Amino acid sequence: GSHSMRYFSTSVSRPGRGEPRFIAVGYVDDTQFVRFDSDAASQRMEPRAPWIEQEGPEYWDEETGKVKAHSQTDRENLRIALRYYNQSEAGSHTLQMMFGCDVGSDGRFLRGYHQYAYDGKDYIALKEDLRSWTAADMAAQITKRKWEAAHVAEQQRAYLEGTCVDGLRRYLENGKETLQRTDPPKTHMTHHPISDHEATLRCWALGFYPAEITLTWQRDGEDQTQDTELVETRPAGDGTFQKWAAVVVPSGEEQRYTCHVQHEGLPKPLTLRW
């Protein structure tokens, strides 16, 4: 389908240790491909999937410089946050930053992102038009006016429609067989009595990529809503994902029920029955 590239960075202050940690991770769709950790020894951007290692020595040099610049600036931003909120350095605080772009199946630019959260709450975000900001509070409004005067939006728009998209297209070509793949789910069902009159049917999907998947239960052709339990999609650890969906059914009636499995890698949906 369409594809995304995202970098996610987390800065955390550590009173007592004394010195903050910055860690950034890079993804294409659901595949992580790089990391940088300010606490680590290398002080380098590092590969986290083999496909990115098609890149030359200059890639690692340049990417390291850029992520180190980010690390310095967001660690400075923690201190600025303290000023704007009138907070003490005695406390630990968190600054999260996400940026990146989406392209279509043919590489066309779709969307760009540049956004921050402080202590788990939205701080500031670049709007879809890539020309203005949404500030979540008074502190963020200070940043917003500053970034407006400095034309930070035009700068980001240029990156997002340029370098960001160019990089993503490049990765999709170089790592084509990894990133443009669909691994369909392997499925099975389990059954667990709850009482003498109710039992749980659980529909399992394993080994799939990308992470998006729809598991649905229906009784005689319609939804179940809050009779169905859907667990958070989870990594298997090997580059594939897992999920399950459960329904509580009347004992002896394990047949008014169907599990339909729908995934991008399935030519036709699966139908499972106990």
Binding site: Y7, G26, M45, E63, K66, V67, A69, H70, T73, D74, E76, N77, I80, A81, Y84, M97, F99, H114, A139, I142, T143, K146, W147, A150, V152, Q155, Q156, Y159, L160, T163, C164, D166, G167, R170
Partner: peptide, 8 residues
């Protein structure tokens, strides 16, 4: 390919 950020 990495981008860049600004001070708050």
């Amino acid at each position: 390919r990495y981008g860049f950020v600004a001070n708050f």
